[PDB]
Design an enzyme around this catalytic site. Structure first.
Site, PDB file in Angstrom:
ATOM      1  N   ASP A   1       0.464  -1.027   0.283  1.00  0.00           N
ATOM      2  CA  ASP A   1      -0.223  -0.156  -0.104  1.00  0.00           C
ATOM      3  C   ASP A   1       0.778   1.551   0.036  1.00  0.00           C
TER       4      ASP A   1
ATOM      5  CB  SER B   1       1.285   6.843   1.703  1.00  0.00           C
ATOM      6  N   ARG B   2      -0.661   5.035   0.885  1.00  0.00           N
ATOM      7  CA  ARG B   2      -2.628   4.360  -0.063  1.00  0.00           C
ATOM      8  C   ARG B   2      -3.362   4.922   1.385  1.00  0.00           C
ATOM      9  CB  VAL B   3      -2.727   5.690   4.912  1.00  0.00           C
ATOM     10  N   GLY B   4      -3.215   7.905   3.252  1.00  0.00           N
ATOM     11  CA  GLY B   4      -3.437   9.474   2.768  1.00  0.00           C
ATOM     12  C   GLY B   4      -2.480  10.051   4.394  1.00  0.00           C
TER      13      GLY B   4
END
Ligand code: ATP
Ligand code: MG
Lengths: 116, 43, 128, 267, 57, 292, 144, 116, 116
Positions: free
Chosen positions: F203, F228-231
């Site tokens: 991710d 980043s996929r979480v943000g």
């Protein structure tokens, strides 16, 4: 030069040297253009285009696909026509007058009919 | 797509040979003016 | 009807004026409605153009050639044309003081160029 | 035509497209500032030089050949800028090849030396970099090696007729002997005691050189924007064709490498 | 005016008068004005394709 | 939020507890430098009393030499960082079964802290060395190969060990585990065989180019390639206010960076983006072993 | 077609004769300098007065070294041809007359000054006396 | 900076930044020319060419291929010569004085002998 | 036209032609301005900006991110709203009246409530 003579050996080396210079500089001709060349590179690009179309003669078996007659140039007529175009005697003619023709006699007759 | 740091001189084609000839011609003309000015200042 | 075209912008451009007084080389002559053809040299003075009433715009011209045509046209071609409010009184005194000290102090065209700059700076400072 | 040769050709073509796109955007910003200088020079040619139209000033017979001045630039990459200026000066020199040529640039002096090298009498370099002003036109007119001893004085330049294309125009300049011999030259109140005939002829040479340099710089900048846009568009078509060849070569390299390991392990 | 006493013509006299009037006016209003009075052009007279000494200013 | 210490990692691609952040890059371009600075920056939380703020490191050196494992363990002991960090020694001088099972053995020891109420952070260095050890044992056991001389379970071998490092809920204990796998690329090609499999399963990925490291960017972290996929959901609220405005200014200055060579033709909006973009990129450059 | 920038020898100058290494000691350096100056002519530059001698000598040296098929030369005939092209004696001749100048120089050295050709093949080197005699005979033979 | 010192760390970072920046500026000169370079870009192109030729010294085992004698520079002489050329103390010298030379002493002797 | 009918094929071809001409003309509008065009180019550029935002309606599950209500336009309501904007019936409306809206009835209620 020991089988074709000294006259036929010089015409083959001069025609191959002009086509190799225009092919290596094609990356600047297709990107920047033909105006980015100098004075010596401009005259070699125009003579290489006319020498490539003059060697393509219409065969007798391909008359139904091209529409023109079959041209059979001899060995002595092909060496005299290539040496006169590389010396500057046919620089005023167009590039379409030598495409699908014979020797030096067919190139002069095609340029006079297209300008009339 | 990316990573084009000096890709012109690393190819070695038409653009690679023209870049080396342009830099060598500019350095040869500037070296003649620097060598002539250094000899006149020492005498 | 004036044609005050300089080498940077157009002032009069179209024919929409009445009277204009520009300092020439002979005297301070002014053009009326349709002046005669008297193309004379313009000196470094003030070129005021009265717009009908009292809406005149004082333009300090740097000198040119006030050409007048015979068909009610006045072409005032100058190099620089700025207003009287675009100049400061403190900065104008520095150029007039440096030109007076440099005059008759060297040779070549250094002493000849300082005499023309002192005469043009004294005429613009007296018309404030 | 391997994997290493396709990666070097694709990366080098991508760097040429970014430099061509950035040069076209920079040429659009410089064309806006150059439009004010080109529009201001046109007003001086119709107001300050209006005395020659009302007096009908023209030349007559030739006096010791003539004088030509080719106004251009010193840099390239502008399309047919140097080719159009040299072709216009070579056509007018057929009837009078004994006239002198004054090249005002490295691009115009290189093309004129291959056809008429003996006609070049003046060469000025360094004028195509920055914008033209009144100081550059006045210095070239006073040091033209006797410019007032000629009957005809032409100024070859490039006139921008539109905002994309241009054309090579020409403007004549009268001498001191031709300004006083006009038809309606006595209609103006001019002082015969002071310098009036020689002053009006010398001021017209610097005024015409400033208008030709301003119009030539705007035409060269407009032609350079079209050449930069064509080079950027041609680079995108070559990058798209090279990407299709690199994708087929990458899939063929994986199949050829896997077939060699499968053939040796099964024997 | 003083064009007969000096060796300059009407072209050089107009540039000297406009440059002196611009520097004697407002010092803060000199935006985009100093480039018209300063140039780095060169002049070199050719002969036969050789040339003489190239001048500056 | 996972405090890494870098100014360009905590504002752009901010990693969190339970996610998988890949460390892609070429040879000597900032691969192991990002993993060593993040483990040494946890001394402010592990030395206290808050067990939920601490994060035990788990450096799994696989494929490295004997001199590389001894130099990394000596630097962490001098800065008080080896007391709560597991070291899985797996050199290339052993067998192929010991190097291939180094990713599975290091994940089982670090999973005990996440299942109790603590946090962990695994650093599989490197992901490229673990794929070569698994293909060597399968080729000698009379098995058919696939692409790039690999077995059929090439994508399943790396996805099974990376999916175990996740963030648990409140009913399981409240722990998490971070996976920092370093993907050693060939010559900057991020779309290879082993490079594409690790980037699609994780991710987020941090790219490292060799051209930006020689210019002055320490370390070389491309903002246009790393994401980043979480943000902003796994970051602090104080740092999220300044990272919102800096993301828009850094993206606009990268596309207009070609006009820096012609500074004499800049406009009003072009001069403001070039001056602000150059100061923001130089302020985030930190030295080695100097986390903030 | 032998590329000077790609083909190289690991033995160096130890595998060559002393006569050919003295007259052509700067042959490897002249090929690299003439290749960079030949590409500048196709760009529009016509200046560089100091580079006119090196650009003209590089074109005549490449045509003189190109021999025909089944036409090998000895060490005595190759030492006189390489000395006139590296010292600037062949810069005043034409490019098309490079083939005729090689046959005329070898024929005049075998009937007039035959002592200079036999000394370069027997001894294999050139001292102070051999260098002065070869330079004077090459300058006088250029004017027919 | 902890093994070679703070003075040797700044010279290695400054030489790598000047050589990497010259590769990006060389691509724009092959399409636009030298007119796009300003005052800072013109001085960086001349300093990058002299720094690349100064690091190439003639080896002792390669005397049969080069011709010149072998030169051996110490560690203290190489760091002092690279820091002086990057500041502006050897900007008036040519690029041929540093090619196939030793340290800072051999670069000053080659410039005076080539001008005579 | 043989699956969706002759009425749906004409509305889809007209909207695709206006969006393709406005995207290709974006490179010339940034270098020549917006007022340096003809009469036919100025009317087509104003209608292309409002047609690009009219097709982007707010979904029902995305009400917590944009704040607008969810609009579910049918097939008959979407074809009638696109045909009226291309004929000149909504040329006097603003460009922001069609953003975050769906159907022909939503564009008339948002334009009258924006000003008054
Ligand atoms: N931000 C930085 N600033 C200064 N130096 C750095 C930085 N990052 C890395 N380095 C230097 O790079 C060297 C190698 O770093 P690192 O261990 O991260 O890569 P590596 O594992 O050696 O790469 P590879 O495995 O390809 O050899 C270190 O000695 C360090 O000094
Ligand atoms: Mg590592």
């Amino acid at each position: 030069v020991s089988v074709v003579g000294q006259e036929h050996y010089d015409v083959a080396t001069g025609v191959q040297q002009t086509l190799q210079a225009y092919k290596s500089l094609q990356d600047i001709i297709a990107i920047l253009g033909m105006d980015e060349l100098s004075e010596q590179d401009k005259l070699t690009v125009e003579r290489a285009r006319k020498i490539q179309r003059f060697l393509s003669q219409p065969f007798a078996v391909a008359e139904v696909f091209t529409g023109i007659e079959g041209k059979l140039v001899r060995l002595k007529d092909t060496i005299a026509s290539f040496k006169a175009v590389l010396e500057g005697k046919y620089d005023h003619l167009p590039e379409n007058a030598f495409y699908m023709v014979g020797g030096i006699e067919d190139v002069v007759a095609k340029a006079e009919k297209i300008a009339a | 797509v990316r990573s084009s740091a000096g890709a012109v001189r690393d190819a070695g084609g038409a653009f690679g040979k023209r870049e080396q000839a342009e830099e060598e011609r500019y350095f040869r003309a500037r070296a003649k003016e620097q060598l002539a000015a250094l000899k006149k200042h020492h005498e | 009807k004036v044609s005050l075209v300089a080498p940077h912008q157009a002032i009069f451009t179209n024919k929409e004026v009445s009277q204009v007084n520009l300092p020439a080389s002979s005297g301070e002559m002014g053009v009326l409605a349709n002046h005669v053809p008297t193309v004379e040299e313009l000196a470094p003075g003030v070129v005021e153009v009265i717009e009908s009433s009292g809406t005149a715009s004082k333009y300090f011209v740097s000198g040119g050639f006030a050409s007048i045509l015979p068909g009610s046209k006045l072409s005032i071609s100058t190099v620089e044309a700025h207003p009287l409010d675009a100049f400061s009184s403190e900065n104008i005194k520095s150029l007039l003081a440096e030109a007076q000290k440099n005059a008759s102090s060297a040779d070549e065209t250094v002493a000849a160029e300082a005499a023309i700059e002192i005469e043009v700076l004294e005429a613009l400072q007296a018309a404030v | 035509a391997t994997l290493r040769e396709i990666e070097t050709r694709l990366k080098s073509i991508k760097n040429i497209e970014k430099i061509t796109n950035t040069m076209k955007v920079v040429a659009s910003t410089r064309m806006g500032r150059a439009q004010r200088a080109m529009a201001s020079s046109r007003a001086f040619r119709e107001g300050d030089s209006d005395f020659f139209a009302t007096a009908e000033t023209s030349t007559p017979e030739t006096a010791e050949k003539t004088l030509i001045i080719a106004v251009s630039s010193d840099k390239g990459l502008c399309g047919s800028i140097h080719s159009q200026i040299a072709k216009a000066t070579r056509a007018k020199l057929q009837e009078t090849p004994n006239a002198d040529v004054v090249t005002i640039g490295d691009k115009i002096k290189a093309q004129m030396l291959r056809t008429h090298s003996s006609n070049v009498v003046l060469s000025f370099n360094g004028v195509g970099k920055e914008a033209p002003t009144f100081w550059e036109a006045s210095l070239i007119a006073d040091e033209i090696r006797k410019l007032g001893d000629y009957d005809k004085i032409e100024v070859m330049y490039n006139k921008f007729v539109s905002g994309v294309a241009f054309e090579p125009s020409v403007f004549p300049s009268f001498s001191p002997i031709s300004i006083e011999e006009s038809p309606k030259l006595s209609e103006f109140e001019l002082e015969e005691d002071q310098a009036i005939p020689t002053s009006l002829s010398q001021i017209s040479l610097t005024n015409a050189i400033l208008n030709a340099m301003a119009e030539g710089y705007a035409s060269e900048i407009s032609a350079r924007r079209n050449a930069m846009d064509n080079a950027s568009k041609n680079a995108g078509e070559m990058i798209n064709k090279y990407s299709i060849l690199y994708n087929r070569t990458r899939q063929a390299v994986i199949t050829n490498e896997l077939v060699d390991i499968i053939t040796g392990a099964s024997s | 005016s003083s064009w007969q006493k000096a060796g300059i013509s009407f072209n050089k006299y107009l540039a000297i008068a406009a440059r002196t009037v611009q520097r004697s006016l407002k010092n803060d209003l000199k935006v985009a004005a100093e480039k018209r009075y300063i140039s780095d052009a060169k002049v070199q007279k050719l002969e036969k394709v050789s040339t003489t000494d190239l001048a500056s200013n | 939020p996972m405090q890494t210490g870098l100014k360009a990692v905590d504002a752009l691609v901010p990693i969190g507890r339970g996610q998988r952040e890949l460390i892609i890059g070429d040879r000597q371009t900032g691969k192991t430098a990002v993993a060593l600075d993040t483990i040494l920056n946890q001394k402010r939380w592990n030395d206290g009393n808050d067990e939920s703020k601490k994060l035990y490191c788990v450096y799994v050196a696989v494929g490295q030499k004997r001199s590389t494992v001894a130099q990394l363990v000596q630097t962490l002991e001098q800065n008080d960082a080896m007391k709560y960090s597991i070291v899985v020694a797996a050199t290339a001088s052993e067998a192929a079964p010991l190097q291939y099972l180094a990713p599975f053995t290091a994940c089982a020891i670090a999973e005990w802290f996440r299942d109790n109420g603590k946090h962990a952070l695994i650093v599989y260095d490197d992901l490229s060395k673990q794929a070569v050890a698994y293909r060597q044992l399968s080729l000698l056991l009379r098995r058919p190969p696939g692409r790039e001389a690999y077995p059929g379970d090439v994508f399943y071998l790396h996805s099974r060990l990376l999916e175990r490092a996740a963030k648990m809920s409140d009913a399981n204990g409240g722990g998490s585990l971070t996976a920092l796998p370093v993907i050693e690329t060939q010559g900057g090609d991020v779309s290879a065989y082993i490079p594409t499999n690790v980037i699609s399963i994780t991710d987020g990925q941090i790219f490292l180019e060799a051209e930006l490291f020689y210019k002055g960017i320490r370390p070389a972290i491309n903002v246009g390639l790393s994401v980043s996929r979480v943000g902003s959901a796994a970051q602090v609220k104080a740092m999220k206010q300044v990272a919102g405005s800096l993301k828009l200014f850094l993206a606009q200055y990268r596309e207009v960076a070609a006009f820096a060579q012609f500074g004499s033709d800049l406009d009003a909006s072009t001069k403001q983006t070039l001056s602000r973009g150059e100061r923001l990129t130089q302020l985030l450059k930190q030295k080695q072993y100097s986390p903030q | 077609a032998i590329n000077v920038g790609l083909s190289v020898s690991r033995v160096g100058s130890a595998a060559q004769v002393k006569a050919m290494k003295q007259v052509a000691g700067s042959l490897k350096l002249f090929l690299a300098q003439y290749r960079e100056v030949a590409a500048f002519a196709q760009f529009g530059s016509d200046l560089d007065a100091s580079t006119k001698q090196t650009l003209s000598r590089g074109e005549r040296l490449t045509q003189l070294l190109k021999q025909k098929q089944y036409s090998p030369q000895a060490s005595e005939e190759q030492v006189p041809v390489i000395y006139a092209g590296v010292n600037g004696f062949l810069d005043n001749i034409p490019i098309e007359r490079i083939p005729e100048f090689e046959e005329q120089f070898i024929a005049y050295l075998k009937a007039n000054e035959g002592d200079i050709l036999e000394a370069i093949r027997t001894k294999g080197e050139l001292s102070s006396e051999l260098l002065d005699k070869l330079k004077s005979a090459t300058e006088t033979f250029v004017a027919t």
